[PDB]
Each structure stands twice: as C-alpha cells, then as structure tokens.
Amino acid sequence: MSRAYDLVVLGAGSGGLEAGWNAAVTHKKKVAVVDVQATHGPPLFAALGGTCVNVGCVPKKLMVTGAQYMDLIRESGGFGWEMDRESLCPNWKTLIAAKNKVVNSINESYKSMFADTEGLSFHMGFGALQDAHTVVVRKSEDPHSDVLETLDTEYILIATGSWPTRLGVPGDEFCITSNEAFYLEDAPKRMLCVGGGYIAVEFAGIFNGYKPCGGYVDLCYRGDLILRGFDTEVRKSLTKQLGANGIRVRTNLNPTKITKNEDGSNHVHFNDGTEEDYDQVMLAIGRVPRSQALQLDKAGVRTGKNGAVQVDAYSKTSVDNIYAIGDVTNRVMLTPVAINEGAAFVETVFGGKPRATDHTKVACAVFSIPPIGTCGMTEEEAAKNYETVAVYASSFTPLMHNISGSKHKEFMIRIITNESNGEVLGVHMLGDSAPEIIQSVGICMKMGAKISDFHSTIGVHPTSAEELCSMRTPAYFYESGKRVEKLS
Amino acid sequence: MSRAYDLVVLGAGSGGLEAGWNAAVTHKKKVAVVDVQATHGPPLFAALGGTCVNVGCVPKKLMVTGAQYMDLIRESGGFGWEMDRESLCPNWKTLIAAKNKVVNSINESYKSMFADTEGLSFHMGFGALQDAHTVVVRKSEDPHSDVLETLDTEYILIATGSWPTRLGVPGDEFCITSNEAFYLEDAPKRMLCVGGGYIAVEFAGIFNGYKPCGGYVDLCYRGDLILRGFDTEVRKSLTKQLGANGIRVRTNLNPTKITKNEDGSNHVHFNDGTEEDYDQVMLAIGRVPRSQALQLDKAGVRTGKNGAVQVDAYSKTSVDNIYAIGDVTNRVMLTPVAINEGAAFVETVFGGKPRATDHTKVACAVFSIPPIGTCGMTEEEAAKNYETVAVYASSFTPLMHNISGSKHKEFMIRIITNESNGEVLGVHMLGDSAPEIIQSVGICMKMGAKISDFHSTIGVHPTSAEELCSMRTPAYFYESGKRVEKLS
Ligand SMILES: Cc1cc2nc3c(=O)[nH]c(=O)nc-3n(C[C@H](O)[C@H](O)[C@H](O)COP(=O)(O)OP(=O)(O)OC[C@H]3O[C@@H](n4cnc5c(N)ncnc54)[C@H](O)[C@@H]3O)c2cc1C
Ligand SMILES: Cc1cc2nc3c(=O)[nH]c(=O)nc-3n(C[C@H](O)[C@H](O)[C@H](O)COP(=O)(O)OP(=O)(O)OC[C@H]3O[C@@H](n4cnc5c(N)ncnc54)[C@H](O)[C@@H]3O)c2cc1C
Ligand SMILES: CCN(CC)CCOC(=O)c1ccc(NCCC(=O)c2ccc([N+](=O)[O-])cc2)cc1
Ligand SMILES: CCN(CC)CCOC(=O)c1ccc(NCCC(=O)c2ccc([N+](=O)[O-])cc2)cc1
C-alpha cells in the first residue's frame, strides 16, 4: 500500500507546480512533477512554470509594457520633451531578446528549486494515466512511443492546462497563435488579429505598438462587440480608444480562405467577401482544455464538454484519488485561481482540514492599450439574477491628458449594486492603473462591501481611484426586468 | 433677524468652496464666498478654487507627471525604443505654459459656476470679522485699507487655509516656496530644496526631472531621515531611490546665511559650515494656518498653537454660529478631508441631521519620484498604542525593471496588524501605482478589515497590487513594548 510517490502532478503549471511545492515543503510528501520542457522553447511551447510564465501572462505583460512606451514617448511632448519624432518606430529584436532572457531566468529559477527541495522531483515527458495509481511518462505525446518512467503513486493531480483553439477552415495551417507570436522573427507590418478574446485585444495592442514604420493592425471579431462577458459600456469605450490608437476594429467578419503569396505574406478571404494581405493572421479564438492525450478513459476519469475534466468544488474527479485544477477543469481559466485551486487541494488532501476555492467575485484585468479592471457582476447578469439593481457610472478624462493631447483616454468607472441592500455586486473600470486599483476593490467585494462604504471612505485628491468614493446618485436602475427609474 | 446672506465663506478653498455650493444647491441658502483672486496669478498666489487647484495638488501633479517622463524615456531603451539619447533635457517653458493653461481653465470653470448657480455669490477681497454676524471685505490684507463690501450673515465659515512657513535667518528673503516655484522663469540648474516634508520631496523630484543639462538637485533636511510620520522602512527605501535618481540627499544639515552673487545666483552657508551656490533655495518647511489677518479676537473666536482655529468634531468654533475647516483648523491638512469637513458642516447646520468627519484611517499619498501610498498606523505608533502587534512586509522588484534597467525601483508593502484580532491597522506602500492602490485599500480599512480578508481574496497575476493578498507570515512583532518574536 506504499507507492513510490505520494502525489504525481501532470504539468508544472502555475496551479500544478504550486500544489507540488506546497505538499513537499509544508507537509513533506514525496512529490513528482511532470512537464514537457526545462526552458521556454518553441517546439512544445509551455514548460516548467506553466503557460503563464512561458507563453502567457508574464511575457505578454512585458510586451504590453513595451508597446505602452509608444504612447508615453508621444505624450511627453506636451510636457516639454523634445526629441526625434520622425520615423521613431521600435526594435522587436531587442524586445523579444530581453523578454526571453527574463523568462529564461525564471525557468532557471525552477531548476534550482527542485534541486534544493526535499523530495520534490521533476520528470520531463508526456504524462498519461495507465490506471488510478500509475502514471506513464512517454517521450512523445504519441501513445505508441518509448516509455521513460512509470510513476507509482497514491494520488494524481491533473494540471495540464489548456491549448489554443483553431478555426476549422482552408488556409488554417498558415496562421499563428499567442504561442508562436512570442517567438516571431520580426515585427509584422501588416497584422491581422482574429477573435475578440482578451488575448486578441492585448496582442493587437502589442503588434500595434511594435509595428514598423508605415504598418497597421486589424482586429477581426466574429460578432458585434469585442470582449463578451465584460461591462458593455467598457467594451464600447475600449473599441473606441483602440480606434484612436490605430487598431482598425472590424466586426461581424471572419476569414474563410487563406493562401500564401510568393513573397511569404498571406492572402485572406473574409465573410463579407473582401480580400487583403497580412504578414500574419493570429488566431485568438480562445483556449480548449488539454486532456486530449492523457487517456482519462483508461483510469475511469470522465470529461464533459470538449475535454474539461469533471470535478467538484474540492477539485476531486470521477475517481476518489485523482484530482484536477486550473485551465483543464474549465472553471475560471486564470492563474491566481489555478494557484488557489491547487493550494486548497493540499489543505484538502494532505492538510487534513479541507477547503474549496471561492469562484465568485474574482477580480481580473485586461492589459489592453488602455487596460480594464473588473470584479463581479455586469448589468446584463445582475439585472437578471436580482430584484432591484442600481447602476452607478462616472466617466472622466484625467487632468494630465489635457497637456499630453491624448484626450481620447477617458477613465471610466461603473459600480453595479443591488438597490435592496446597497451591496456592490460588480465594479468595472477602464483606464490606466485599473488593474492595480481593482485588486484592492476585489478585497472590498470579498468582504461583501456596500456602496455606502465606498463613498463614505475619504479620498486621495489626485488619483483616478478616488472617483470610486464620489459615486452616490445612481445613473439608472433595472427593476426586476428592463431599464427604468425609481417606481413605487 | 434676517441677514442678507445665510452663510459667508472666507476662502473659495477646496473645503470652503464645496460648502458654499452644497448649501446653495441642495438646501437653497443665500451664500457668499470671499477670495483674493479670480485666476491663479502670482502676487497673491491662491485663488478661486483654493491652494489645491491653483498652487498645489493639481499643478504639482502635472509637473510630477512631466518629470516622470525622464525616467520613462530612459527606461524604454530596454524594450527597444532607440532615439536621441545625448543631451535630451526637457523644456520648462512648455511645461509651465501648458500647466497654466490647465489651471487657468479651471478658474474659468468656477467663474461660470457662480454665474449659473442659484444665490451663490463671489466677492473678491480680504475677509475680516467685524463681529459674529458681520464680515468686512477690504481690498488690502492691511486692516487700514478701503472697504469694498460689508456682508451681513447668520453664519460664518472660515476656510482660509494655510501659508508657507519661513525659516527665520539672515538671507531668508532671497529664497522661494512652493508658491513661487510654480511660476519660475526657467528650470534651475543648481537647485536646493530645504526641508523634508512631502512638498520638498515632490518638488525635489520635479526640479530633478526638469533640470537642464549638467545640472543637479540637493535636498536638505534638518533631522536624520526625510518624511517624519511615514513608515520608517518606506522612508529609508525612498531616500535610497532618490539617491539612485540623482537627488543628493543631505541630513542633519540646514542653512543659516544666504547672500546673492553678482550673476543673480545665491550663495549658501550651512550647519556643518560648508558653502555652495544654488540658483534657488526653496523652503518646504511646512505650512502655518492662515488666520493671522482675519481678526478672530474681535468676534470672540479663539486660536490655539500658532493660529489654528479652535474647533470641535462638528467644526464649530469658540462662537456658536461661526465654523472653520481644512488647513486653517490644523486637523489633517489635505483636500479631500477639508472637502468632507465642509460637506459635513452643510449636513450639520443646513441639513438638519448632523455628522462629524472621520479623521482616522485617512489614506493619502506622496507623489515622489517613486510615489508612496499610506493609510493608518505605523509600527512606531501601533506598537505603542496596542497590546500585541504583528508586522508583515514584502519588498520586490517588478518583472519589467529587469528589462528597463532601473533595478533600484523596489516595490515595497508592509501591513501592520493587531495580532490579538488580526485587524489591519495600517498599510504602507512605496512604488509606481501606490496612490491608486491605497485608495481602495483605505476603503477596506474603513470597513475595519483584517489580514485574513486580505490574503483570502483572489489575486490578479501581473500587478504590484496582488502582493497585498500574498502576505501571511508576519516578518516580526512588537509585544507590548519593543521588537520581538512570538512568546507565550
Ligand atoms: C497569452 C496568455 C495570456 C494570459 N494572461 C493571463 C493574465 O494576465 N492573468 C491571468 O491571471 N491569467 C492569464 N493567462 C492564463 C494562465 O496562463 C492559465 O490560466 C494558468 O497558467 C493555468 O495554470 P494550470 O496549472 O491550469 O496550467 P498551466 O499553467 O497552463 O501549465 C500547464 C503545464 O502542463 C504541461 N503539460 C501539458 N501536457 C502535459 C502532459 N501530458 N504531461 C505533463 N505535462 C503536460 C505544459 O507543458 C504546461 O507547462 C494567460 C494565458 C495565455 C495563453
Ligand atoms: C504644494 C502643495 C501640494 C499639495 N498637494 C496635495 C495632494 O496631493 N493631496 C492632497 O490631498 N492635498 C494636497 N495639498 C493640501 C491642499 O492644498 C489643502 O489641504 C486644501 O486646499 C485645504 O483646503 P481649505 O478649504 O482649507 O483652504 P484652501 O483650499 O487652501 O483655500 C484657501 C483660500 O482662501 C483664500 N483666502 C486666504 N485669506 C483670505 C481672506 N482673508 N479672505 C478671503 N479669502 C482668503 C485663499 O486665496 C485661498 O484661495 C497640497 C498643498 C500644497 C501647498
Ligand atoms: C446562440 C448564440 N449564443 C452563443 C452560443 C450567443 C451568446 O451570447 C453572445 O452574444 C455571445 C457570447 C459569446 C461569444 N463568443 C465569445 C467571443 C470569442 O472569443 C469568440 C470569438 C470567435 C469565435 N469563433 O470560433 O468565430 C468563438 C469565440 C459571442 C457572442
Ligand atoms: C523634542 C524633539 N521632537 C520635536 C519637537 C522630535 C519629535 O520626533 C522627531 O523625530 C521629529 C518629528 C518632526 C520633525 N519635523 C518634521 C519634519 C519637517 O518637515 C520639518 C523640517 C524642518 C523644520 N525646521 O523648521 O528646520 C521643521 C519641520 C523632526 C523630527
């Protein structure tokens, strides 16, 4: 009844790698972690540290940080910074160069974690399930290939994460995704970003910031308005400010045919039936769970709609000893969630006294050219699920953009309460510093905060943030139905 | 028993001007507001809108916004922004030019407020008290001079604010203050900022950002460490990062003699007994209340230490009908406070049901080269006033500054709880976006938040802010006395 390892993790992911460390250090279990790579190389993109550290949130943010400098360089002129204006385009070489260095140094950090840690062991391969207690480790994703190790274990945790969705049409093979986008040769001049997910809109921002001289970027969404699930007024204001920063947004539009020209570039045929050339199209259609190879069938774990592992509120699967977390499960699909989900699993199983991860009122951000910070319910949902909701709102252009001449940069806020009790159901912010503000906002909404607590708090004179504490008069209400004013 | 005006305000200040409007609009009282000026001119520096709008927080912030671009221009290089490096100094002309335009347009905003508003009247002069119900309006601060109006009123509100303190030594007349600093001719090459108040440290930052090529800035504090009353580790880390950004800090040092040279520049003699030349010395010694001219004696209002008006928790003075708010009172000396103090006065007097302004746990910021955001108690105080306090701390250098090569920019946080109950007594942050974060932090501490609520909240993956929700292990404690660990 004693296995070689107490716990095998399939994926050194933001969520998985956390679980492994927590088990091994606080509780001193014999832990094994499987992944596909040491460092952040292209062929198989993810690695030790997960999709976040290697081909997501971290490098993404560094490139977003880079692309911002376009606007800041431009903006400084107002405050009296005179310099080379003509032909000031940026150097994609030196960005990705210094980017890789950073990501590389984190992978290097993880190597000497495993070395230094008590009974935490890394195993480079492709984790499959043989049964409830046996984890195969092949050298190919191919179930035919050579077998490097056979890990015998009391528990399994599936933290394999997710993979880019692919639009099924002729020409599809010529496109790229977030993954390939991180290791592009040069900055694309003529760029198309297909889709309207937070990935598309960030990267549109990036390529637009790092486009060469003469170049442009188009965004191309299937539907009406980009960013489904966000506050519709933020969504509208963002599409506007992407307009004003160069990103040519197109809606109710989607490619069908792509074919590659003699110069290397790609020719594209659309829904409307127009034709344009781009140096790359990037498919940001979303992300499917990554359970396609693990053989969950063979161990008696079962998967619902399109691969997602069936779990409960304590992350246990169809089998009692097997568990799953983060993007594979399809619950939320963010890092600090997957990290919580994995940390709760350690308190659950190996820590005796259990706990479930709190999926409600999770604050998150979009790192778009002017970024979004959101936490909790929209109008769309709150008006439906609650009796009488009040909607507060206040857009404003900060003092400084009168000088900088980027007068398009309207900072927006909009609180969504339940009028019955005054409880803040959701806060939605668009503008510079929104992701930093929303974090501490999301602490307030965790404590069930009410609009009375917001405006009664004193405020800092010069920050965008203080306009949270100056919202008293609701702009309008939804009264158990559609939009209205305050009836008896 | 019917006066011409219900309420006379002495000072169209951030606090006073608010009171006037609130009375006049929600409650429809006959209101009069006195001030010294329409627009933001030098001779008498303040104006319609107050010290904040005219010669403080607003222009201050615009210049701080300007000076930041020095570092951002520099920093962009890492991310691949190649341009004119050599001799890229800024243009003080175009800053102050565009600054004034902005401030001017706010003064212009206030003119057409008074015009548009029901029974809100502006009166340009120097408000004195003749008695409990009579307000003189002279054309000089001089009590001898001509009398422009005599305002008859049921109530008076003294919101005259504050004025720069002056170090009493030979040469003092050659120096400047925040006030004169806003309308300087050119950027000073060789600058001295005397004092260690938040004003000094901001302006040091400004002149340092806007110094010409070859120039420098010295800060000169009377005592050991700049910024008394802030968290001593933030204070130390800031002095370090001001070092790294060029500001040569000097402590236990203070001038005695100043004398003006044949080229216009000023020669300075110090405590240690060294001699240096500066184009200006700016005295940021602090700010005294501005009750020196009003003749409070004559109306039976009385003033304590160095002019501050004696008030209670509902802002009433030594006389029942007279009140006072903001910097004149000496309670807190910030805008959004003075605004609350003035808004509560309207609920108090004219609104029937009264209220007192909540002076505890007021969040505020310092807009220094890397800024500070603080709310509530330090260790220094909490260890003294509470039984068993725990101190949490976590400094870190953001992902991006590995690329930008400003590796001095360490983001610091340090929560100070009471270990008995886990209540967050104070949060202290140093680094970029600290003032935006602290606002929503100060909402949490208004709701009496506890460190358990902080770390239990989920977190955004890429922001400095999320390191609030990752602090569990206290770094150390004070156990009813000095610094220690956890004894039975
Ligand atoms: C472009 C992009 C930007 C993002 N930005 C953000 C953001 O700003 N904020 C945020 O909160 N979230 C962001 N995310 C989401 C975040 O990356 C994930 O939600 C998070 O990494 C999920 O963690 P996880 O443990 O489920 O799996 P992951 O962290 O995805 O790790 C999965 C690991 O498992 C490995 N693996 C796969 N198959 C196998 C196998 N058979 N055997 C062994 N190992 C295997 C992979 O190589 C990988 O290293 C972003 C994602 C992307 C793609
Ligand atoms: C350089 C600087 C930077 C600052 N930065 C910040 C910041 O970032 N954040 C923050 O919260 N606070 C800041 N402050 C503080 C803020 O300016 C004040 O606390 C706030 O303005 C106080 O409001 P008040 O109503 O008491 O008086 P004030 O707003 O100071 O207004 C006083 C008005 O009364 C007028 N007056 C004077 N004497 C008379 C008289 N006899 N008759 C009629 N009128 C008269 C003056 O002309 C003036 O317009 C700063 C101050 C300075 C000097
Ligand atoms: C019956 C119609 N409902 C969808 C099944 C519409 C539900 O409400 C919407 O308005 C809605 C919701 C989601 C939605 N997709 C999310 C956007 C996205 O990232 C996306 C973009 C393109 C594709 N695509 O494969 O073309 C898919 C998702 C589009 C519209
Ligand atoms: C008995 C000594 N106490 C002061 C009466 C010291 C109390 O604790 C201090 O360490 C302390 C507190 C405040 C303090 N001054 C505030 C700093 C400031 O802005 C200032 C700078 C210069 C002068 N000055 O007139 O030289 C005054 C204030 C200095 C030291």
A4 and A132 together in one domain: yes
Domain span at A181? 165-285
Cα dihedral B224, B229, B232, B234, rounded to 10, equals -110
Resolution in Å equals: 3.4
Cα→Cα distances B33→A146, A483, B9, B115, B127, Å? 86, 41, 5, 13, 10
Probe ligand 2: pick from B130, B135, B335, B357, max atoms within 8 Å of CB?
B335
In three-state secondary structure terms, B332 is: coil
Q: Number of folded domains in chain A?
A: 3
Query: Looking at beta carbons, which residues of chain B come within 8 Å of A101?
Result: 402
E strands within B105-203? Answer: 120-124, 126-131, 134-138, 147-158, 162-164, 190-194
Query: Looking at beta carbons, which residues of chain B come within 8 Å of A66?
Result: 76, 79-80, 403
Of B334, B360, B386, the last residue of a domain is B360
Radius of gyration of chain B (CA): 24
Q: Are A58 and A68 in contact (CB under 8 A)?
A: no
The H or E element containing residue A430 is: strand A423-430
B302 and B399 together in one domain: no
Residue B482 burial (10 A CB sphere; 0-12, 13-18, 19+): exposed
Cα dihedral A142, A146, A150, A156, rounded to 10, equals -10
* Ligand 1 centroid from CA A327, angstroms: 7
> Domain of B412: which CATH number?
3.30.390.30
> Domain of B175: which CATH number?
3.50.50.60
Classify residue A465 as left (phi > 0), alpha (psi -120 to 50) or beta.
alpha
B353 and B314 together in one domain: yes
Nearest CA to ligand 2 atom 53: B56
Question: What is the Cα–Cα distance from B167 to B285, expressed in whole angstroms?
Answer: 7
Of B260, B285, B310, the last residue of a domain is B285
In the block, tokens 């807190």 appear at B332
Of A242, A270, A285, the last residue of a domain is A285
B151 and B300 together in one domain: yes
Cβ within 8 Å, pair A439-B444: no
Q: Are B306 and B327 in contact (CB under 8 A)?
A: no
Confirm whether B461 is a catalytic residue.
yes
A367 and A418 together in one domain: yes
CB distance from A161 to chain B under 8 Å?
no
B242 and B185 together in one domain: yes
DSSP letter (8 states) at residue B298: G
Q: Are A24 and A119 in contact (CB under 8 A)?
A: yes
Q: Are A176 and A280 in contact (CB under 8 A)?
A: yes
The neighbouring-strand residues paired with B450 are: B423
B171 and B144 together in one domain: no
Probe ligand 1: pick from A55, A57, A282, A366, max atoms within 8 Å of CB?
A57
In three-state secondary structure terms, B327 is: helix
B320 and B252 together in one domain: no
Query: Looking at beta carbons, which residues of chain B come within 8 Å of A91?
Result: 80-82
B279 and B240 together in one domain: yes
A98-118: b (≥16 Cβ within 10 Å) or e:
bbbebbeebbeebeebbeeee
Q: Are A197 and A285 in contact (CB under 8 A)?
A: yes
A321 and A226 together in one domain: no
B187 and B294 together in one domain: no
> Experimentally, how was this structure solved?
X-ray
Torsion angles phi and psi, residue B41, rounded to 5: -60, 160
B47 and B187 together in one domain: no
Cα→Cα distances A54→A38, A58, B477, Å? 11, 7, 38
Q: Which two tokens mark A70?
A: 């376009």
Nearest CA to A83 out of B299, B418, B90 is that of B90
